[PDB]
Amino acid sequence: GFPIPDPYCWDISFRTFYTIIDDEHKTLFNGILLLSQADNADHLNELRRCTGKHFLNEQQLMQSSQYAGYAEHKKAHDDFIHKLDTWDGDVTYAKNWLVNHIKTIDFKYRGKI
Amino acid sequence: GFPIPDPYCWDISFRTFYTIIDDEHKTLFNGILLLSQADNADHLNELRRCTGKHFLNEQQLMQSSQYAGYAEHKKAHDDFIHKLDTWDGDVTYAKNWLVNHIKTIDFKYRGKI
Amino acid sequence: GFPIPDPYCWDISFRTFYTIIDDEHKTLFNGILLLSQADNADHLNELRRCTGKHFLNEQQLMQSSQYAGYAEHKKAHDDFIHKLDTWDGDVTYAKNWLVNHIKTIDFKYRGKI
Amino acid sequence: GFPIPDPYCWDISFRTFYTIIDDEHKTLFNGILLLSQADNADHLNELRRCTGKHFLNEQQLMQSSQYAGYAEHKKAHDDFIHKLDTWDGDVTYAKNWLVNHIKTIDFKYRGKI
Amino acid sequence: GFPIPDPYCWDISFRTFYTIIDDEHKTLFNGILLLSQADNADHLNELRRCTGKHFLNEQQLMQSSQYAGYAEHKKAHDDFIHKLDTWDGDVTYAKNWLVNHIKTIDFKYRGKI
Amino acid sequence: GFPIPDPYCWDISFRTFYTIIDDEHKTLFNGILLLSQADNADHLNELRRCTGKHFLNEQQLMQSSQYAGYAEHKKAHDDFIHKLDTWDGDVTYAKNWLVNHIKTIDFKYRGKI
Amino acid sequence: GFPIPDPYCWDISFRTFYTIIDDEHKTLFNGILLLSQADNADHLNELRRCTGKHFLNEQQLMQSSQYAGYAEHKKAHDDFIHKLDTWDGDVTYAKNWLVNHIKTIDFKYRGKI
Amino acid sequence: GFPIPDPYCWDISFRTFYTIIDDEHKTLFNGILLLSQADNADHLNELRRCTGKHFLNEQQLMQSSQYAGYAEHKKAHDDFIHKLDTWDGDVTYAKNWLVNHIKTIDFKYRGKI
Numbered sequence: 001g002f003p004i005p006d007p008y009c010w011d012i013s014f015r016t017f018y019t020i021i022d023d024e025h026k027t028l029f030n031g032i033l034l035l036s037q038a039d040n041a042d043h044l045n046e047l048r049r050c051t052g053k054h055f056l057n058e059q060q061l062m063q064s065s066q067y068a069g070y071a072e073h074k075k076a077h078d079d080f081i082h083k084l085d086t087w088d089g090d091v092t093y094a095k096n097w098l099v100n101h102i103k104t105i106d107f108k109y110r111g112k113i
Numbered sequence: 114g115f116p117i118p119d120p121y122c123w124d125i126s127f128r129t130f131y132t133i134i135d136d137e138h139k140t141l142f143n144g145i146l147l148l149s150q151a152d153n154a155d156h157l158n159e160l161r162r163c164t165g166k167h168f169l170n171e172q173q174l175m176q177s178s179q180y181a182g183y184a185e186h187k188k189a190h191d192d193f194i195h196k197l198d199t200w201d202g203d204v205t206y207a208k209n210w211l212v213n214h215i216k217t218i219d220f221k222y223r224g225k226i
Numbered sequence: 227g228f229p230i231p232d233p234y235c236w237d238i239s240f241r242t243f244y245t246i247i248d249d250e251h252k253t254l255f256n257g258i259l260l261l262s263q264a265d266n267a268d269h270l271n272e273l274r275r276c277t278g279k280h281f282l283n284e285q286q287l288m289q290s291s292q293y294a295g296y297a298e299h300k301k302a303h304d305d306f307i308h309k310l311d312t313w314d315g316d317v318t319y320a321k322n323w324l325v326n327h328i329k330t331i332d333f334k335y336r337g338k339i
Numbered sequence: 340g341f342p343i344p345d346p347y348c349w350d351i352s353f354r355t356f357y358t359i360i361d362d363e364h365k366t367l368f369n370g371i372l373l374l375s376q377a378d379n380a381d382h383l384n385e386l387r388r389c390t391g392k393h394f395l396n397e398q399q400l401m402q403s404s405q406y407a408g409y410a411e412h413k414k415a416h417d418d419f420i421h422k423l424d425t426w427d428g429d430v431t432y433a434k435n436w437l438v439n440h441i442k443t444i445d446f447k448y449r450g451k452i
Numbered sequence: 453g454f455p456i457p458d459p460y461c462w463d464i465s466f467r468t469f470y471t472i473i474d475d476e477h478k479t480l481f482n483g484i485l486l487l488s489q490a491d492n493a494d495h496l497n498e499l500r501r502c503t504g505k506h507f508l509n510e511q512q513l514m515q516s517s518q519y520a521g522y523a524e525h526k527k528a529h530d531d532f533i534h535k536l537d538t539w540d541g542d543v544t545y546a547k548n549w550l551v552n553h554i555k556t557i558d559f560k561y562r563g564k565i
Numbered sequence: 566g567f568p569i570p571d572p573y574c575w576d577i578s579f580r581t582f583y584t585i586i587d588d589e590h591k592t593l594f595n596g597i598l599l600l601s602q603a604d605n606a607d608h609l610n611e612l613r614r615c616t617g618k619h620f621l622n623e624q625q626l627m628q629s630s631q632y633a634g635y636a637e638h639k640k641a642h643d644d645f646i647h648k649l650d651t652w653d654g655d656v657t658y659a660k661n662w663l664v665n666h667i668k669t670i671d672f673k674y675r676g677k678i
Numbered sequence: 679g680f681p682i683p684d685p686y687c688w689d690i691s692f693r694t695f696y697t698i699i700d701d702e703h704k705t706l707f708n709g710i711l712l713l714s715q716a717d718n719a720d721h722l723n724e725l726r727r728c729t730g731k732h733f734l735n736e737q738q739l740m741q742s743s744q745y746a747g748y749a750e751h752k753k754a755h756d757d758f759i760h761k762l763d764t765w766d767g768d769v770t771y772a773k774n775w776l777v778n779h780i781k782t783i784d785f786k787y788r789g790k791i
Numbered sequence: 792g793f794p795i796p797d798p799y800c801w802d803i804s805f806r807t808f809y810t811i812i813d814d815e816h817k818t819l820f821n822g823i824l825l826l827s828q829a830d831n832a833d834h835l836n837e838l839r840r841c842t843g844k845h846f847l848n849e850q851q852l853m854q855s856s857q858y859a860g861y862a863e864h865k866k867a868h869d870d871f872i873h874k875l876d877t878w879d880g881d882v883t884y885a886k887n888w889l890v891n892h893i894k895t896i897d898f899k900y901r902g903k904i
Contacts, residue, residue, distance in 0.1 A: 007346035010369055012381050017808045019904075023389065026369045027362050030349055042351050045224045050362065052179035066730035068763050085181050111723045113810075120233035123256055125268050130356045132452075136276065139256045140249050143236055155238050158563045163249065165518035198520050226358075243469045245565075271450045278405030292617030294650050311407050337610045339471075384902045391857030424859050459572035462595055464607050475615065478595045479588050482575055494577050497789045502588065504744035537746050582695045584791075631843030633876050676836045678697075685798035688821055690833050701841065704821045705814050708801055720803050728814065 002103050004095050008033045014102050016110060018061070024054040028098055036091045048084045055081065058106070065113045076105055115216050117208050121146045127215050129223060131174070137167040141211055149204045161197045168194065171219070178226045189218055228329050230321050234259045240328050242336055244287070250280040251328060258320050265315050274310050281307065284332070291339045302331055341442050343434050347372045353441050355449055357400070363393040364441060371433050378428050387423050394420065397445070404452045415444055454555050456547050460485045466554050468562060470513070476506040480550055488543045500536045507533065510558070517565045528557055567668050569660050573598045579667050581675055583626070589619040590667060597659050604654050613649050620646065623671070630678045641670055680781050682773050686711045692780050694788060696739070702732040706776055714769045726762045733759065736784070743791045754783055793894050795886050799824045805893050807901055809852070815845040816893060823885050830880050839875050846872065849897070856904045867896055 005011055010029040015022055031047025055077040062070045080097060118124055123142040128135055144160025168190040175183045193210060231237055236255040241248055257273030281303040288296045306323060309316075344350055349368040354361055370386030394416040401409045419436060422429075457463055462481040467474055483499025507529040514522045532549060570576055575594040580587055596612030620642040627635045645662060648655075683689055688707040693700055709725025733755040740748045758775060796802055801820040806813055822838030846868040853861045871888060874881075 007348065007372075009346065009348060009372055011373065011376075012385065019388065023363075023366050027365050030365045030369070033346075033348055034350065037350075042224070046351065048181075049178045049225050049358065053177060056177065056179055064731060064734065065727045066734055066759060068726075081179060111720070112727050120235065120259075122233065122235060122259055124260065124263075125272065132275065136250075136253050140252050143252045143256070146233075146235055147237065150237075155563070159238065161520075162245065162517045162564050166516060169516065169518055194518060268450070274407075275404045275451050279403060282403065282405055290618060290621065291614045292621055292646060294613075307405060337607070338614050381902070387859075388856045388903050392855060395855065395857055420857060459574065459598075461572065461574060461598055463599065463602075464611065471614065475589075475592050479591050482591045482595070485572075485574055486576065489576075494789070498577065500746075501584065501743045501790050505742060508742065508744055533744060629844060629847065630840045631847055631872060633839075676833070677840050685800065685824075687798065687800060687824055689825065689828075690837065697840065701815075701818050705817050708817045708821070711798075711800055712802065715802075724803065727810065 002099050004099055005029075008036060008095055016102070016106055018110075018113075021054075021058060021061070021106070024050070024057065025102060028054060032091065032094050032098060035094070039089045039091070044084070044087055048081075051081065051084060061113050062109060067109060067113050069108060069112075073105055073109070076101065115212050117212055118142075121149060121208055129215070129219055131223075131226075134167075134171060134174070134219070137163070137170065138215060141167060145204065145207050145211060148207070152202045152204070157197070157200055161194075164194065164197060174226050175222060180222060180226050182221060182225075186218055186222070189214065228325050230325055231255075234262055234321055242328070242332055244336075244339075247280075247284060247287070247332070250276070250283065254280060254324055258317070258324060261320065262317050265317070270310070270313055277310060278307065287339055288335060293335055293339050295334060295338075299331055299335070302327065341438050343438055344368075347375055347434055355441070355445055357449075357452075360393075360397060360400070360445070363389070363396065367393060367437055371430070371437060374433065375430050378430070383423070383426055390423060391420065400452055401448060406448055406452050408447060408451075412444055412448070415440065454551050456551055457481075460488060460547055468554070468558055470562075470565075473506075473510060473513070473558070476502070476509065477554060480506060484543065484546050484550060487546070491541045491543070496536070496539055500533075503533065503536060513565050514561060519561060519565050521560060521564075525557055525561070528553065567664050569664055570594075573601055573660055581667070581671055583675075583678075586619075586623060586626070586671070589615070589622065593619060593663055597656070597663060600659065601656050604656070609649070609652055616649060617646065626678055627674060632674055632678050634673060634677075638670055638674070641666065680777050682777055683707075686714060686773055694780070694784055696788075696791075699732075699736060699739070699784070702728070702735065703780060706732060710769065710772050710776060713772070717767045717769070722762070722765055726759075729759065729762060739791050740787060745787060745791050747786060747790075751783055751787070754779065793890050795890055796820075799827055799886055807893070807897055809901075809904075812845075812849060812852070812897070815841070815848065819845060819889055823882070823889060826885065827882050830882070835875070835878055842875060843872065852904055853900060858900055858904050860899060860903075864896055864900070867892065 008029060010022075010026040014025060016025075027050040028047070031043070031050050034043040035047060037043075059070070059074055059077065062073060067073075080101070083093070083097075121142060123135075123139040127138060129138075140163040141160070144156070144163050147156040148160060150156075172183070172187055172190065175186060180186075193214070196206070196210075234255060236248075236252040240251060242251075253276040254273070257269070257276050260269035261273060263269075285296070285300055285303070288299060293299075306327070309319070309323075347368060349361075349365040353364060355364075366389040367386070370382070370389050373382035374386060376382075398409070398413055398416070401412060406412075419440070422432070422436075460481060462474075462478040466477060468477075479502040480499070483495070483502050486495040487499060489495075511522070511526055511529065514525060519525075532553070535545070535549075573594060575587075575591040579590060581590075592615040593612070596608070596615050599608035600612060602608075624635070624639055624642070627638060632638075645666070648658070648662075686707060688700075688704040692703060694703075705728040706725070709721070709728050712721040713725060715721075737748070737752055737755065740751060745751075758779070761771070761775075799820060801813075801817040805816060807816075818841040819838070822834070822841050825834035826838060828834075850861070850865055850868070853864060858864075871892070874884070874888075
């Protein structure tokens with residue numbers, strides 16, 4: 001278990017060293033913070049758009065080097081989209097999910113893509 | 114039921130806030146107006162090309178954020194192409210179809226893609 | 227000296243056979259049509275954006291084949307941008323300008339770019 | 340004169356309806372937030388990179404439609420780059436600058452680019 | 453039956469009005485002329501590369517507007533590649549094939565893509 | 566001093582091993598061939614377009630690797646554009662020019678760009 | 679059997695005449711040399727990334743001209759990735775594999791793509 | 792003052808964490824290695840091409856985030872191009888130059904571009 005930032009914002013400990021990836025991640029932190037402030041459709045739309053987009057871009061980056069962990073990673077992503085598409089308002093889950101995802105799954109592709 | 118513009122041209126009430134989308138939509142209004150002036154092959158070709166192109170671009174935009182309503186939207190598009198490919202000269206149908214499509218189906222992706 | 231379409235909308239007599247160019251032209255016609263219905267800011271912004279975008283894209287297209295008539299063409303474009311930036315509500319001027327510009331200046335690059 | 344969000348993070352009141360622009364803005368907010376926590380080099384590099392990248396992309400976007408307010412806008416951007424290149428630790432200035440810049444200068448191009 | 457140019461070179465009667473397409477077609481005329489001069493591997497390689505490339509690009513152009521005749525056209529292309537991949541030295545067939553293909557199959561997509 | 570192919574068409578002795586470059590060259594040969602059959606405007610426009618496009622693309626290619634012989638090369642190109650812009654019907658000049666240009670100036674960048 | 683360079687580095691005998699391909703190949707020689715110096719995860723990651731990327735790019739190049747040997751070539755590539763993904767430390771195999779691959783399989787696409 | 796790798800090949804101590812940059816650097820190392828084996832034209836062309844291409848790409852990368860140290864960096868690059876354009880066979884200079892350039896000038900932009 002990694003610490004959950006408060007305020008729930010990206011910090012340099014999340015750096016992957018892929019600047020486009022890092023810049024997209026900042027948008028996912030932000031989407032989750034807005035929902036924590038107000039659980040509404042606008043905020044969910046914002047997060048869901050940024051998530052969908054980030055997951056696809058990152059997947060494309062993985063495929064460009066035929067990354068061996070692509071299948072498993074894509075599955076993790078798809079499971080989170082499902083959660084956003086069946087949103088129940090569990091912001092705590094989302095806060096945790098994103099921190100652990102970056103620091104354990106994204107961190108495993110560093111130097112391989 | 115939304116009002117059918119006369120002359121059958123795009124107005125700012127159709128704005129989606131995606132400038133490329135709006136610019137493509139203007140070409141679909143125009144294609145339908147020409148057919149209303151003269152139901153010939155040139156006019157149908159023009160509309161059919163612009164429709165095919167717009168539908169594909171918009172679909173690509175939807176996919177870039179893994180838009181959850183993609184499947185349903187694509188199906189709506191494909192049904193209209195079919196109509197254009199089996200054209201019977203029913204310009205009234207087309208005039209209605211396009212107004213309702215933009216204002217109810219396209220308007221639902223705003224803020225999500 | 228060419229006729230002014232009424233309603234003020236693109237027709238196949240304006241085809242340049244550059245589909246990209248034709249599709250952008252359809253947006254300039256629409257832009258002038260809106261102004262002709264309501265001379266306001268939303269409508270002028272719409273024409274202005276489309277005009278600026280079309281003129282630059284067309285200019286790029288000319289540059290790609292090192293078109294001999296570029297400088298003269300670009301000077302024509304810049305003059306019209308200038309009129310839009312100092313709009314005076316002279317919708318008749320604009321209806322006229324566009325019709326002649328396409329049918330005389332743009333028709334000139336066909337087959338050369 | 341606009342309120343400063345606390346915590347210093349992007350919110351939907353800043354939406355420009357250009358998703359690319361909004362997503363880059365989220366990175367400038369985060370950049371200023373880091374500096375507000377720790378005024379060090381890692382944090383300033385992060386803000387500086389994101390700022391330089393966003394300003395140039397936004398500038399390109401303005402240029403694509405030959406935006407009339409470009410020169411004034413670019414001069415605003417260049418002044419802020421300059422402050423970052425001679426950073427003085429004035430985090431309050433930066434919090435302020437960004438908020439007003441978006442809500443006044445960037446809001447101005449909406450519908451024109 | 454259309455006349456077979458002699459020398460076997462592209463002329464403006466083959467124009468499709470798509471400059472990229474026309475420029476690629478010129479390379480197919482050339483590939484067939486070389487083979488007519490000397491039926492060797494170099495010449496076949498040249499034609500086969502240019503054919504493969506042209507067919508794919510043109511197919512991509514067709515798909516961008518969801519051209520209704522794509523399937524039939526692609527099949528015609530694939531049948532010619534097969535011939536090149538099982539080359540028997542029948543230059544007369546190839547000379548005929550290309551003239552008839554452009555003037556009857558390619559000419560049918562004009563204004564639709 | 567190189568032989569002039571008859572018929573005036575590209576052959577593999579002109580290969581530069583840059584497939585893009587070779588394919589554009591084939592269009593310049595064809596352009597000169599048309600003029601050699603009929604010295605008219607359709608034919609000159611065709612050569613002129615292809616020439617302008619090829620020279621700029623090749624120039625870009627040179628620039629991408631910061632080619633040392635660029636300035637000299639570009640000056641050669643610009644002189645020939647100039648002859649085409651003041652065409653005098655001297656088809657012999659053109660047949661000659663192209664053959665030597667490729668086999669001397671273009672052959673020089675091989676392996677350096 | 680072709681000679682194995684020592685030091686295990688790319689030389690001009692490996693030239694394919696496709697500069698992007700040659701530049702990528704240099705990265706595969708380097709990846710294998712590092713492993714020969716120290717069989718660790720960093721070195722394997724480096725080679726595996728460069729291999730995955732090169733194989734995909736080259737495959738894309740093959741497909742752009744509908745290269746007839748694509749299937750067989752892709753299979754050869756996939757078999758090598760498998761080896762890297764089940765790495766047993768047999769650097770000798772890898773040194774041999776790459777030399778023979780370039781000089782017999784890659785060399786067969788020259789002039790065809 | 793950094794050690795010179797022997798054999799003169801890239802190693803992970805040179806990583807900048809910009810995979811594109813690292814992969815281009817590997818080509819400069821190889822270029823200098825060839826010259827170190829045979830001081831001829833094929834080898835110098837190879838280094839020169841790769842150097843020109845890498846320096847411009849890296850320069851573009853710097854420009855994309857409006858890097859503060861660009862002008863100083865570009866001046867360093869241009870000096871080395873100049874040495875290659877007036878090659879004197881001083882391979883020791885080159886081995887040295889590259890090692891220090893990366894480890895001092897290039898290492899400086901990390902995290903800022």
